[PDB]
Structure 1
Amino acid sequence: LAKLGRNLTAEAREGKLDPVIGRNKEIQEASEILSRRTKNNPVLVGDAGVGKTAVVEGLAQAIVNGDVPAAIKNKEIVSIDISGLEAGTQYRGSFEENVQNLVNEVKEAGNIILFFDAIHQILGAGSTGGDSGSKGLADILKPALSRGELTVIGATTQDEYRNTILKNAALARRFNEVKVNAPSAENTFKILQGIRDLYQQHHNVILPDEVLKAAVDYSVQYIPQRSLPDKAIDLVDVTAAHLAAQHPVTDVHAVEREIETEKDKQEKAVEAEDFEAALNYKTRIAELERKIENHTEDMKVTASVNDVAESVERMTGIPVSQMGASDIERLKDMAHRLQDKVIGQDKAVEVVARAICRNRAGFDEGNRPIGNFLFVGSTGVGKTELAKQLALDMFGTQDAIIRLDMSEYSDRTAVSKLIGTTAGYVGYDDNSNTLTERVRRNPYSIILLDAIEKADPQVITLLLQVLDDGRLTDGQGNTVNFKNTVIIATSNAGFGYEANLTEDADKPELMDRLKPFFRPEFLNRFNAVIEFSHLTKEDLSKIVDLMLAEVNQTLAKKDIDLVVSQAAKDYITEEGYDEVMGVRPLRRVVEQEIRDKVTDFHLDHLDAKHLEADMEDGVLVIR
């Protein structure tokens, strides 16, 4: 049926396959794929182009070489291309007979195996979910499964397998589950030596062992993707692309165009039978051809392994050139690296970092999402620095984070004064535009529940009781499976007191103040809690030292950099350390005080490097 398709054993008989190894255990697991006499259609799993096809091609290779038992002797494999469904019908004719014509050859041809890369869409012409009623093959093959005539094999998503329950009588009573995969870095390296000999000749590049190791050992730290085993190709591909910026302009064709001229004269010298001239041209061209071929030797492509490691930053934008051998370095130092940029209490990192530590170390129970975190505080700096700064040390950019706005969950005001009514609480922020499509790209993300208190304890109770098993069944009956997800829930906290030096006198009573909108069943699921702790009349200058740095970092884009006095604090803090507000005035005073004065002197075209921001009597007079 490779007519109509691709005969995979025929390409195996011709040596057309990539002999990748280390996947031998999945060929060992293919001992049952080939041997089961009935009800024998497995359920493979893998990524798009993962190479689980290459396993079955590796199985086909095992069939050609006789590395298989006699149960599968002389059994051909053909890949049936369902993606070419309806091709050639013009949507005026029919295809369903070309499906029964797949059956009509192999039922009598005898000893045919059939293959697919990945299918769920076959059950469109069958029993499926959202794509029910569409065109497919199952209307012809679902009988073939029930009859036991055709066995067609291939992979899909393990969570897509849930639709077996729709027609379990045809699918559950004919299938057997495969153990998914185990892409270890140990077998990666031997493959990576196979990868260079496949690609390093493309760009005249050398990819030694330290580059292959660095392509995974250095990159694994910053790749949360399932596509890591092939990320090493991207790094050496982009490396050659960036190294190719050295020699894009060799005029190899300047000599080739000379040869085509001299050869064109040579052809005319021959027709005139002038062979002193014809020989002279063959003489020159031979030298000219040797000149071209020798240009290759002046274009050796050699990255340093440090340059390959720098490729990880160039096309990602993640400032990590300082690294590293950083399996442990990040575990211990990212916690210290955080607090250098934090404005608030210091014990918050020990709560959140340890969960990033024990997971990355691998010391975590068999089924736990990271753990449920609760930060009690108020809006602004205290609310957002933790989630933002963790995301930049964990993941580097503003991608793997979702904010759950409880403002859409106001029990008091949900009468469509704002976004909607009470009925808007369900369904939309369960799987709709857009929740799940971001959870699937980022199974691992930061969840932020913004300000718990807006709703009934049952609203908030739904998510947290369900995060025990790292799995949530949505309104449509589909299950989202959570990997390694951290939730930082947030509330509007505080406490009323006698004197500002007695704010921290009543420690557990913060939870009693916040009690009305939750219960101990909600509280006891959290990892000890992160406190309310306040802005102190203490080293305020650390905020001012960073803000002043943000001024010059902002001005540095136009090569503008002033001297800024540390005495700027003396006018800022006067409102800054007000316990009523916290860190509210800090940004408002600086962005008003300096910004306007530096603007007035750019008009005089004065060089910033010789101007000094020196305040006098609470007024900034830049020198």
Structure 2
Amino acid sequence: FGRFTERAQKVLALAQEEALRLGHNNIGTEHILLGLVREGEGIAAKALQALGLGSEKIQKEVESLIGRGQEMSQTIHYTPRAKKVIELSMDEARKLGHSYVGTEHILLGLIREGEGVAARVLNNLGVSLNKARQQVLQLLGSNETGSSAAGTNSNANTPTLDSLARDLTAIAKEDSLDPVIGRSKEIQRVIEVLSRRTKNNPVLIGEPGVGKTAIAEGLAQQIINNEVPEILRDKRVMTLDMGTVVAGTKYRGEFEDRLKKVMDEIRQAGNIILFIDALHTLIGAGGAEGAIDASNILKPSLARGELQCIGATTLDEYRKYIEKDAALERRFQPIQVDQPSVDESIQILQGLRDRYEAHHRVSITDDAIEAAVKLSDRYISDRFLPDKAIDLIDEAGSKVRLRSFTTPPNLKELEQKLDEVRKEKDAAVQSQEFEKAASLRDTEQRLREQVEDTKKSWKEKQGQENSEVTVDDIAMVVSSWTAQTETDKLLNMENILHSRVIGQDEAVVAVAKAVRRARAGLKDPKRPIGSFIFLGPTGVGKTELARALAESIFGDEESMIRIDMSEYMEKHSTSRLVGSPPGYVGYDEGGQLTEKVRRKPYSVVLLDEIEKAHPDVFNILLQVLEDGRLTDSKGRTVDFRNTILIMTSNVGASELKRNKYVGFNVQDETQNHKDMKDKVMGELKRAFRPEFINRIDEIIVFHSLEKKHLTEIVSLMSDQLTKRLKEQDLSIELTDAAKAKVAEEGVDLEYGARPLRRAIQKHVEDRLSEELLRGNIHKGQHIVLDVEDGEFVVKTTA
């Protein structure tokens, strides 16, 4: 593997030595056995010494196979039998914890593969093979955190702790706990509120989403040893774990019975600390429905202080417990739990790096880890800032680790050859045709040593990746899904936003810098990554930048919400037939807008045409842009805190859609362009209040239609066509010249831009499908549609 211990490796090498000492050309498992007993009193060796085996005794049996002397050091590698015994030992060390592998596992693995060369050595020398595996097993993997013992005494605690549940305190006597991270100052605030015995219940409110449970392990460690008052002396810390409760329970009544039992034993009161994660669920209050109504027993328990407990809730959760009162107000008392401070995230990362050495490429790159956080919060953006983080780490901490064994030097062709050989070889002997297989057989094995030699020349491709988790890598992986290539995304955001939005640079750079500003990692991710107003007509600019922001901001353009404010009027978007209006603005606020962004805290949220809606909608939007949150949909809190809010506007649209027109000359065209990139910022102001527009980071400017838009419509539609031909394979691109010939059947004055579908269909879809049938084009290679002399032409390229 790359995780083994000395003693293991040492028992193994001793085998090769005995192979040759005994004349065995191929180092049998029999020699692995010798290896084990020849390492003397190693965990394997020692085991063998118990069963009654000396290095010699093994070696004689071993010698009775091939025996002295038929070793010229010819093909002195292991036997396939012996190779199996080793593979088993690695797993036999997973078994005994051990991420590495000890001596024992090698003897244990030997036993497992019990009919081999080894096996026979022990089973001939009067040692039952499993009697040997016993003996090794009962001599540990040799992985510990150190230990000691001295015993305790009887105490009241006996009935309780069985049920339900694990106790942090036990595991901390011989420590194995970690802080882990914090959110340290939160732990302190508990002890006033808990060295209380009448509103003695702390209640942590944050978000999921900070690793709330980290703060909890904090308490455990510090409340035992040793700075705690005599108030909270005679302490036990008990966690009430949900998982054991749900198991073996088929109904609500039985679940309640288990909770009742806990409450009865809870008489250990005021000297016991109970940790209840997700506190809200038990109270069962608020909403259309609850979950379970433990509250009846639980409310007096909190008031009495018999249940002296710690509640872990999120943004939304608390409301449905303090609303019941007043043994929630003579219980609960609040404590500040972050909307992640970036640094706290980072520390979690460092802690779990070595275990992504079981996901190899981590431990390290440290620098990449900080980035894991920093790039992730802003680039996907969806999750919570430490999940976000870690995703970059392990992804990148694997992506390249895949690239490790992709080839030899490209001697993958070698392996391919060795196969083909076997066939020939075989089929020839299968007729027999002895030497007509023989030379093929030889050619096979030629290949074989070579294969393995150059597949392990790509141990150099291992040494590259197998502990770097690389900066660029981490960044790349966030960029891949949906430091370097996210900060190249941030710094070069404008470049990325420019490549998708054509014309109106004015808007792009304004957004670019504002998001990039946020994207430093600083601005605070408790409030959107960007607020914006995106001006421009219904045409060209706005949406496209929002999308392009998904690309630049998030890594790929694979996250852009878009909610219409005209639905937030009550009407103008359920007009006549279309849509469902169930109290319609109430539906949008009350559910729709909040639900969508609650799924994706990620995306560029584009709240469309805030012109047509009344100023009242905007007061609501203003909270979204400022607070970074809105609360609706049964009291749920929606994170707009790393969204990019973009509110669009236009009512002068027509002027930005104004034809180029030959008003006298072709410089009426060049007076139509320049004019429209000016005209926009006043079409914003005219249909609604200013108060909203000021929340916005920057005022983004766009414009559209002229003459010259028709051949741009052809370039939107033809690209949707060719992409639906990509879905089940076919790579197409149209050159602009070919889009022109399509437009040629579209400059009807009497039938508008209707003929464009038909001519795009005719020259692209229809033409490609009727060309795939010819064999002119090739599915899965790149197909360029151009006009050359004057007519449309399909050409092919790789």
TM-score of the superposition, structure 1-length normalised? 0.71
Give SS of 2:641's match: coil
Code of the residue aligned with 2:688 in structure 1: it is F
Aligned partner of residue 356 in structure 1, secondary structure: helix
State the shift of 1:299 in Å.
8.7
Which structure would you say has the larger RCO, counting Cα contacts within 8 Å and 6 or more residues apart? 1
**Match for 1:425: what amino acid?**
Y
Q: CA 1:538/1:307 → structure 2, altered by over 3 Å: closer, same or farther?
A: farther
Query: In structure 1, what residue type is equivalent to 2:586?
Result: G
Match for residue 792 of structure 2 among 589, 596, 620:
620
Pick closer, same or farther for the CA change 1:572–1:190 going to 2, 3 Å. same
1:436 to 2:606 alignment: no
CA distance in 1, matches of 2:348, 2:697: 42
SS of the aligned residue for 1:59 comes to helix
- After superposition, residues 49-60 of structure 1 pair within 5 angstroms as 51-60=211-220
In structure 2, what residue type is equivalent to 1:73? Answer: R
**Pairing of 1:319-468 with structure 2 (within 5 A):** 324=484, 327=487, 329-361=488-520, 364=523, 369=528, 370-379=530-539, 381-382=540-541, 384-395=543-554, 396-404=556-564, 406=566, 411=571, 416-420=576-580, 424-432=583-591, 434-452=592-610, 455=612, 457-458=614-615, 460-461=617-618, 463-467=620-624
- Counterpart CA distance in 2 for 1:610 and 1:161 is 57
User: What is the total number of aligned residue pairs between the two structures?
Assistant: 562
**For 1:108 and 1:307, how far apart are their aligned partners in 2?**
49
Shift of 1:215: 3.7
1:318 to 464, 480, 487: 480
Report the Cα offset of residue 17 of structure 1. 2.7
Superposition deviation, residue 349 in structure 1? 0.5
In structure 2, what is the equivalent of residue 214 of structure 1?
368
In 1: Cα distance, 2:240 partner to 2:404 partner: 40
Q: Deviations over 1:96-116 (max 9, x none)?
A: 565444333332576221112
Please, which runs of 5 or more residues in structure 1 have no aligned partner?
Answer: 248-295
Q: Is structure 2 residue 333 aligned with structure 1 residue 176? A: yes
Q: SS of 2:550's equivalent?
A: helix
- Does residue 7 in structure 1 map to residue 167 in structure 2? yes
Q: What runs of 5+ residues in structure 2 fail to find an aligned partner?
A: 1-159, 408-455
Alignment partners' CA distance in 2, 1:337 and 1:419: 35
Q: Are the aligned partners of 2:560 and 2:603 in contact in 1 as well (CA < 8 Å)?
A: yes
Q: Where does 1:270-289 land on structure 2 (aligned, <5 Å)?
A: none
**How far apart are the structure 1 equivalents of 2:351 and 2:587?**
48
Q: Does 1:156 align with 2:294?
A: no
Q: Distance in 2 between matches of 1:18 and 1:483?
A: 30
**Contact kept in structure 2, 1:401 and 1:447, CA below 8 Å:** yes
Matched, 1:605 2:775: yes
Q: What residue in structure 2 maps to residue 17 of structure 1?
A: 177
> In 2 relative to 1, CA 67–615 (structure 1 residues): closer, same or farther, beyond 3 Å?
same
Partner Cα distance (1:68, 1:463) in 2: 46
Q: Is the 8 A contact 1:239 1:303 kept in 2?
A: no
% identical equivalent positions: 39
| Superposed displacement of residue 568, structure 1 | 4.8
Question: Are 2:303 and 1:146 equivalent residues in the alignment?
Answer: yes
The CA deviation at 1:618 is: 3.5
Question: CA offset at residue 151 of structure 1?
Answer: 0.7
Assess if the C-alpha contact under 8 Å between 1:331 and 1:357 holds in 2: yes
Q: How far is the alpha carbon of 1:405 from its aligned partner?
A: 7.2
RMSD, aligned CA: 5.2
Q: Which amino acid aligns with 2:588?
A: D
Q: Structure 1 residue 180: deviation in Å? A: 0.7
Cα distance in 1, alignment partners of residues 631 and 369 from structure 2: 38
Q: Distance in 1 between matches of 2:750 and 2:494?
A: 30
C-alpha separation in 2, matches of 1:366 and 1:232: 18
Q: Counterpart amino acid of 1:345? A: Q
* Matching residue's letter, 1:137: A
Please say if residues 115 and 152 of structure 1, whose CA atoms lie closer than 8 Å, have aligned partners that are also in contact.
Answer: yes
The 1:128/1:312 distance shift into structure 2, 3 A limit, reads: same
Amino acid corresponding to residue 233 of structure 2 in structure 1: K
Opposite residue 480 of structure 2, the aligned amino acid is I
Matched AA of 1:141 = L
State the alpha-carbon separation in 2 of the partners of residues 414 and 607 from structure 1: 45
CA-CA distance at 1:439 after TM superposition:
1.9
CA shift for structure 1 position 356: 0.5
Alignment check: 8 A CA contact 2:567 2:585 kept: no
* Residue aligned with 1:8, SS: coil
Distance, in Å, in 2 between the alignment partners of 1:528 and 1:188 is 30
In structure 2, do the counterparts of structure 1 residues 144 and 311 end up closer, same or farther at CA, with 3 Å as the change threshold?
A: same
Cα 1:522/1:507, change in 2 over 3 Å: farther
Name the CA shift for 1:575/1:394 in 2 (closer, same or farther; >3 Å): farther
What displacement does 1:338 show? Answer: 1.7
- Deviation, 1:555, is 8.4
SS at match of 1:160: coil
1:335 is displaced (CA, Å) by: 0.6
Question: Once the 2 structures are TM-superposed, how far is the Cα of residue 578 of structure 1 from its aligned partner?
Answer: 12
Give the distance between the partners of 1:90 and 1:552, measured in 2 at CA.
Answer: 53
Task: Give 3-state SS (helix, strand or coil) of 1:169's partner.
Answer: coil
Note if 1:135 corresponds to 2:292.
yes
| Structure-2 change in CA distance of 1:110 and 1:570 (3 Å) | closer
CA contact (8 A) 1:189 1:213 kept: no
Code of the aligned partner of 1:44: L
Separation of aligned partners in 1, 2:261 and 2:786: 88
Amino acid at match of 2:362: L
Asked whether the 8 Å contact 2:238–2:274 carries over to 1, the reply is: yes
Q: Is contact 1:86-1:94 (8 Å) kept?
A: no
Distance in 2 (CA, whole Å) between partners of 1:473 and 1:190 is 31
Q: Residue 585 and residue 450 in structure 1: after superposition, are their counterparts in 2 closer, same or farther (change >3 A)?
A: farther
| Cα distance in structure 1, aligned partners of 2:345 and 2:404 | 27
Aligned to 1:62: 222
* Partner residue, 1:533: 703
Residues 189-227 of structure 1 show CA distances to partners (whole Å, capped at 9, x for unaligned) of 665454244553x46x463432x4324425642342312
Residue range with higher mean Cα deviation, 386-395 or 165-174: 165-174
Q: Is the 8 A contact 2:566 2:610 kept in 1?
A: yes
Using the TM superposition, name which of 480-489 and 514-523 deviates more: 514-523
Do the aligned partners of 1:403 and 1:448 also contact (CA within 8 Å) in 2? yes
1:73 maps to 2:233: yes
> Which residue number corresponds to residue 291 of structure 1?
none
Letter in 2 for 1:138: S
Cα distance in 2 for partners of 1:338, 1:583 equals 29
Summarize the alignment of residues 75-114 of structure 1 with structure 2, pairs less than 5 Å apart: 75-82=235-242, 91=251, 98-108=258-268, 111-114=271-274
Amino acid at match of 2:598: R
C-alpha separation in 2, matches of 1:435 and 1:71:
49
Task: State which drifts further: 38-47 or 97-106.
Answer: 97-106
Give the C-alpha shift of residue 123 in structure 1. Answer: 0.7
